[PDB]
């Protein structure tokens with residue numbers, strides 16, 4: 001999965 | 006519930022011989038690197054002109070391709086040689102020097118773990134690194150030094166082959182983490198102690214790693230305050246040293262009996278650098 005916040 | 010002193014005792018008594026460490030922006034502020042863009046800063050005023058509509062934009066691909074300059078300003082500041090590791094970094098380094106360190110997981114892009122002397126093989130840099138770069142067009146790889154001159158001179162680094170913009174290997178939003186990040190499947194089950202320093206635990210997948218150890222494993226947090234799973238969904242062997250991270254670290258070091266070795270180490274390393 002992607003880097004996210 | 007256990008105490009800081011308890012954990013220290015587990016280490017002194019060799020109950021826990023394999024420590025996984027998770028760290029974040031909090032451990033680098035004492036070196037004088039700002040975090041939230043909240044600060045009135047040498048950074049925030051420099052980026053001020055650039056008119057980032059918001060802080061996240063600096064790590065966003067669409068904005069970068071529209072205007073790479075605000076990001077290269079950040080790069081200029083973080084490029085190796087500008088900042089020095091602090092005692093928290095040197096503590097981690099000591100932890101490796103004594104055989105305790107299974108793996109160090111960092112979200113920081115300042116590269117100070119490597120600079121403090123911690124081997125790459127022990128490090129997982131989950132948000133990437135300025136040690137290398139890639140052309141955004143042709144995918145050709147470059148060592149970080151190849152773009153150093155451009156970066157210091159405020160010129161956007163361009164690919165010598167295709168003229169494409171060359172981007173340091175920092176992870177942007179929506180990008181997957183580097184492949185070494187997958188060591189966490191082996192690492193976390195194998196771990197008999199988890200250390201969490203200076204992190205909000207808001208950035209994923211990195212944050213979730215906190216749950217990945219076994220129930221028997223103590224999770225020690227040294228941070229301003231309770232955050233994430235340690236708050237929402239705590240565990241019995243969880244431990245919080247809340248306050249300034251350097252004080253939390255210095256306390257542990259003293260409890261471990263490493264204070265004097267630690268000072269000799271830092272003194273020697275810091276003196277060398279500046």
Ligand SMILES: NC(=O)c1ccc[n+]([C@@H]2C[C@H](COP(=O)(O)OP(=O)(O)OC[C@H]3O[C@@H](n4cnc5c(N)ncnc54)[C@H](O)[C@@H]3O)[C@@H](O)[C@H]2O)c1
Pocket residue numbers: 028029030031032033034035038039040041112113114115132203204205206207208227228229230232248249250251
């Ligand atoms: N040095 C860097 O590489 C750097 C700097 C600034 C921002 N970032 C981004 C931040 C983000 C990852 O989240 P995270 O790493 O948790 O940063 P963060 O800013 O979201 O969290 C830092 C946490 O530690 C706390 N803290 C800060 N200073 C101290 C201190 N001196 N003593 C005790 N606690 C302190 C702070 O209040 C917060 O709880 C990624 O997108 C990074 O690229 C990285």
Ligand SMILES: [Zn+2]
Pocket residue numbers: 140141142143144145164165166167168169
């Ligand atoms: Zn190219």
